[PDB]
Design a protein around this ligand. Structure first.
Ligand SMILES: [Zn+2]
Ligand SMILES: [Zn+2]
Ligand SMILES: [Zn+2]
Ligand SMILES: [Zn+2]
Ligand SMILES: [Zn+2]
Ligand SMILES: [Zn+2]
Ligand SMILES: [Zn+2]
Ligand SMILES: [Zn+2]
Ligand SMILES: [Zn+2]
Ligand SMILES: [Zn+2]
Ligand SMILES: [Zn+2]
Ligand SMILES: [Zn+2]
Ligand SMILES: [Zn+2]
Ligand SMILES: [Zn+2]
Ligand SMILES: [Zn+2]
Ligand SMILES: [Zn+2]
Ligand SMILES: [Zn+2]
Ligand SMILES: [Zn+2]
Ligand SMILES: [Zn+2]
Ligand SMILES: [Zn+2]
Ligand SMILES: [Zn+2]
Ligand SMILES: [Zn+2]
Ligand SMILES: [Zn+2]
Lengths: 102, 5, 90, 89, 5, 102, 5, 5, 90, 90, 5, 5
């Protein structure tokens, strides 16, 4: 579909929102996972999905967290692919099928 | 992490 | 059809909404049928069709109630199929 | 193509809105015609085309009324067809 | 019946 | 195009809006031409294109006025056709071309 | 007739 | 269960 | 696509918006170019692209001004073609 | 694919917004690259994607910045192409 | 002529 | 330059 926030489609534009980032999670990794800071502690949001994630803990992978909470994200699906999302959710859904029941 | 309320 | 609440497309996104579930219906079965708690008594809503159900009886099956009250829901259709829905309506 | 009030797509969902229906027209009959009550007097409305119908006379057929006033309802077209609709007119 | 506004 | 007012798609439903209609043009002719009374003097308005007309003179034809002012109406098109519309504007066009220049 | 403002 | 107003 | 103001699709509906027009640019000409009076000064606006123009100088061509400022208008394109538009833009 | 500000599709229409441009960055180069003056500081905005840019430095290329910041822009894509955009991102 | 908002 | 919301 159409990204919830097109002005944050690019990597650089998302990275600039982190600037002074003081949190256990790498801002470089967060931006590559489509996330951008909203200006509230560690709350980030996906430029495409729109899904927001807060309270990030140490050693958490942005892509995994994106896939865990928003497996319906088309950005996640474009970059990572089906097999990926299905492994985060320990299952094996149909082809072109959104992982929604588990 | 967890979803933003 | 596009889901009414895309941020609730995921199982876990919905599941967490039941936090401490103090009602007779299994929160996991509710979440698997596309529902997420509204934060009002035992009221739940479907992320896709938007349908809302309240006053859940003890042994009620989330999928059955979903089919009975909202056979229009596309999510219900994708996961369960025609038959299932038709059978619920004899 | 898409109904104005999607939640009211099922028969039971519309039917339940009646119960305290104390009027001439058979509720079971209305619901099947795609109607559900606004809860305001005897005013009813179609979940699909959104056309409201009120001041119901006794012995009136919901489907008949539906076709007469809202011949352009796609729900009407799906269920009744042309022959019916054109016959009514 | 009759249509309402 | 989709009608600007579906509830008034049907003839009967447009006809009941005139009722006490006390004016020069026949309410039966206004209803067949897509119009329905808005409840303000003789102000009518098409159910499909939303075009409003008023100040109706003694022997006027609704279909004629309708083609005269709203030549780009899909309903006018559907029922009367190009030949009709073009004749009202005294000109000719060519395939699907919509009368907007005269 | 004439259009409505 | 029952629908929500 | 679809016109920004369908009600002004027809020539005569645009013409009439000029009433007893008291400005240098001819109204019939302005109307033919898809414009109709906003009812403010000499400010006219295109029924399709919705673009507006003001402060019209004597002898100016509504069409040329139309192609110059709003080359992206589909009404302009349909009645004039890529050639005319390119021309006005040398 | 539709521009956020259809009225700013033409170059002239965009240029005239720099009619009183107080800055050094070449206004023509900014307009040609899809940008149009806003009024706050030296903030410019792309008529198509809506992207906004400000604080332009000495020898900057509007197209360069455009591809750098808003790479998903369809205007940028139509005029420059993938190759250009990709080279910009090393 | 010139554009107007 | 730099992006501005
Ligand atoms: Zn995408
Ligand atoms: Zn990629
Ligand atoms: Zn899971
Ligand atoms: Zn549902
Ligand atoms: Zn779905
Ligand atoms: Zn599935
Ligand atoms: Zn049933
Ligand atoms: Zn209906
Ligand atoms: Zn339908
Ligand atoms: Zn059926
Ligand atoms: Zn009839
Ligand atoms: Zn019309
Ligand atoms: Zn039609
Ligand atoms: Zn016909
Ligand atoms: Zn004419
Ligand atoms: Zn135009
Ligand atoms: Zn057109
Ligand atoms: Zn033409
Ligand atoms: Zn030019
Ligand atoms: Zn752009
Ligand atoms: Zn474009
Ligand atoms: Zn080009
Ligand atoms: Zn880059």
């Amino acid at each position: 579909n159409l990204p919830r926030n097109p002005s944050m489609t690019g990597y650089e534009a998302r990275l600039i929102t982190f600037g002074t980032w003081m949190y256990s999670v790498n801002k470089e990794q967060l931006a590559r996972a489509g996330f951008y800071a909203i200006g509230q502690e560690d709350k980030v949001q996906c430029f495409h999905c729109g899904g927001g994630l807060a309270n990030w803990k140490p050693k958490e992978d942005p892509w995994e967290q994106h896939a865990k909470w928003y497996p319906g994200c088309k950005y996640l699906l474009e970059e990572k692919g089906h097999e990926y999302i299905n492994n985060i959710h320990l299952t094996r859904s149909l082809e072109g099928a959104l992982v929604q029941t588990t | 992490a967890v979803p933003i309320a």
